[PDB]
């Protein structure tokens, strides 16, 4: 009967998206974030769950709303773990660019790894390659294994990866291997889902991005029956002496949660059960979702709503504002 709440959760991401859309192209990341955060929190607080924010805007010191540990919901209903990404793509929202979206995942209590806000190496595939990856193996071996499971030559395999300096070496490695590399500007949550979308050319996502984002990916990949491995990585191993300062405290808060960095996390170590509801609403058009449009008094949103237990839904809503 959390099934009954799936629509409630899609309204939460619709609200957050519409709020962030008000600030599209206005050159203010903070105000855009604030609007979507506010809208998401207000709407979650009207839903009949006893939610705890496990993945959110930050710790309470830095994030007054949707902070880690915040209680959300009316408090009626189940105790549930909540992951929020009120805007995935705040820079693009401020600059009027593609691929901004509002994201929420809801799982059983204790379903989501409580990731410190640090880097995570990720390797993500769709259902057709489930059971074929292992971050303890070399990348090249992983890519071969995946292409074989997918029944295509290696030269056809498409890997998407964040276009960042940390990835220069691996991108050239993959290109020398003959793989197609879609080296993307933005974030990796929406991109991770493309591995499970039959109409996307993307077969694999590989590379180092945010750890809390990686757990959101794990929850939706598990729901979609794909596969993922992660590996937590401290800053100095990714980006030194200042990266050592912050990297050392990342390992501190790891130890203070009973999680070890550098060890391969399997899908089930990040998203522990199949009872996940995932909702994402487009702000601007991207690979995964249509953007909001507004003609006068009428706005349209598209929402992808996925439930781990079950049908994948794309909900096109016309809003009379």
């Amino acid at each position: 009967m959390r099934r009954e709440l799936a629509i409630e959760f899609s309204r939460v991401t619709e609200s957050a998206a519409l709020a962030g859309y008000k600030w599209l192209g206005r050159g203010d990341k903070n105000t855009a974030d604030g609007a979507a955060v506010n809208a998401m929190r207000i709407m979650l607080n009207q839903v009949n769950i006893d939610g705890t924010i496990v993945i959110g805007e930050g710790e309470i010191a830095e994030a007054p709303m949707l902070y880690i540990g915040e209680k959300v919901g009316t408090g009626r209903g189940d105790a549930v773990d909540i992951a929020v990404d009120p805007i995935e793509g705040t820079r693009m929202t401020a600059m009027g660019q593609a691929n901004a979206l509002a994201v929420l995942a809801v799982g059983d209590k204790g379903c989501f790894l409580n990731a410190p806000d640090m880097y995570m190496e990720k390797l993500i595939v769709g259902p057709g390659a489930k059971g074929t990856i292992d971050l303890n193996l070399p990348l090249a071996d992983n890519l071969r294994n995946v292409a074989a499971a997918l029944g295509k030559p290696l030269s056809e395999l498409t890997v998407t990866i964040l276009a960042k300096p940390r990835h220069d070496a691996v991108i050239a490695e993959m290109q020398q291997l003959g793989v197609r590399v879609f080296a993307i500007p933005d974030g990796d949550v929406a991109a991770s889902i493309l591995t499970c979308m039959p109409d996307s050319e993307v077969d694999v996502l590989y590379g180092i991005g945010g750890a809390p984002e990686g757990v959101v990916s794990a929850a939706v990949i598990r729901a979609l029956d794909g596969d993922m491995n992660g590996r937590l990585l401290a800053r100095h191993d990714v980006k030194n002496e200042e990266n050592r300062r912050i990297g050392e405290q990342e390992l501190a808060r790891c130890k203070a949660m009973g999680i070890e960095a550098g060890k391969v996390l399997r899908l089930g170590d990040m998203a522990r059960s199949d009872n996940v509801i995932f909702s994402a609403t487009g702000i601007t058009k991207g690979d995964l979702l249509e953007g909001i449009s507004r003609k006068g008094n009428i706005a349209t949103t598209e929402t992808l709503l996925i439930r781990g237990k079950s049908t994948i839904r794309r909900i096109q809503s016309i809003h009379y504002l």
Side-chain angles (χ1 to χ4, degrees), residues 1-41 43-61 63-175 177-293 296-321:
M1 332 159 304
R2 292 227 295 283
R3 186 177 65 207
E4 283 177 13
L5 300 183
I7 202 83
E8 296 296 300
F9 294 133
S10 72
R11 296 173 75 259
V12 173
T13 62
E14 286 174 352
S15 291
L18 283 159
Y21 174 80
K22 292 192 203 307
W23 299 95
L24 178 65
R26 310 215 98 102
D28 186 348
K29 294 205 305 288
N30 283 173
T31 299
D33 259 345
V37 162
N38 177 72
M40 186 164 278
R41 184 180 172 257
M43 292 302 279
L44 278 167
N45 282 351
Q46 297 170 245
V47 180
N48 291 143
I49 55 166
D50 172 21
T52 303
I53 299 302
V54 169
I55 286 149
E57 290 293 299
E59 302 294 337
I60 191 165
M65 280 166 281
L66 299 183
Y67 55 87
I68 301 315
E70 191 176 3
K71 303 308 304 303
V72 294
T74 66
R76 307 217 214 191
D78 296 337
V80 291
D81 271 11
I82 300 300
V84 290
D85 198 349
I87 303 177
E88 165 77 351
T90 311
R91 177 184 55 71
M92 33 255 95
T93 302
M95 298 181 61
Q97 291 175 350
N99 280 293
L101 58 160
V103 175
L104 167 70
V106 180
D108 300 325
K109 181 179 160 72
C111 176
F112 302 156
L113 178 61
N114 193 280
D117 200 357
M118 66 191 295
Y119 288 115
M120 177 193 288
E121 190 192 356
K122 309 178 191 176
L123 175 61
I124 301 166
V125 307
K130 183 179 202 94
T132 68
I133 55 167
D134 183 3
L135 267 185
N136 286 136
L137 302 185
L139 179 56
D141 286 317
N142 278 302
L143 301 180
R144 297 185 193 104
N145 289 337
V146 173
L150 295 181
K152 70 212 294 178
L154 186 58
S155 61
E156 273 177 44
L157 191 78
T158 304
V159 179
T160 190
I161 178 159
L162 295 181
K164 306 277 187 186
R166 65 184 172 262
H167 294 154
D168 287 334
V170 69
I171 285 164
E173 182 187 350
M174 288 186 287
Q175 270 156 10
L177 221 36
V179 165
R180 303 160 91 232
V181 174
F182 286 8
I184 62 182
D186 50 302
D188 58 7
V189 179
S192 72
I193 297 160
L194 299 175
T195 68
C196 300
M197 298 275 156
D199 299 332
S200 180
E201 293 185 4
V202 176
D203 302 308
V204 178
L205 179 146
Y206 171 75
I208 301 157
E213 290 87 349
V215 179
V216 177
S217 291
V220 64
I221 295 293
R222 179 169 188 147
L224 290 171
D225 202 32
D227 203 356
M228 176 179 178
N229 282 187
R231 178 203 310 276
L232 297 169
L233 289 169
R235 192 159 181 87
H236 44 274
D237 306 357
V238 173
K239 293 281 219 189
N240 205 359
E241 196 256 337
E242 260 311 314
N243 305 340
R244 166 149 268 103
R245 196 269 279 175
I246 172 82
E248 220 60 66
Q249 68 213 48
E250 290 164 359
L251 299 148
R253 59 248 313 98
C254 273
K255 201 196 164 180
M257 300 176 213
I259 184 61
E260 53 190 78
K263 216 194 94 295
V264 168
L265 309 146
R266 314 286 169 192
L267 181 63
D269 299 323
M270 292 173 291
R272 309 184 175 108
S273 83
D274 291 343
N275 300 135
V276 174
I277 298 164
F278 175 88
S279 182
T281 302
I283 290 166
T284 55
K285 186 159 201 339
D287 293 335
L288 189 69
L289 287 163
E290 291 286 333
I292 289 166
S293 74
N297 54 127
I298 303 160
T300 62
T301 56
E302 184 182 35
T303 297
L304 175 63
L305 184 64
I306 291 166
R307 194 167 57 97
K309 271 202 186 178
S310 79
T311 301
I312 289 154
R313 283 171 177 92
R314 272 164 182 282
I315 303 173
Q316 325 296 331
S317 301
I318 291 163
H319 306 269
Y320 288 86
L321 307 170

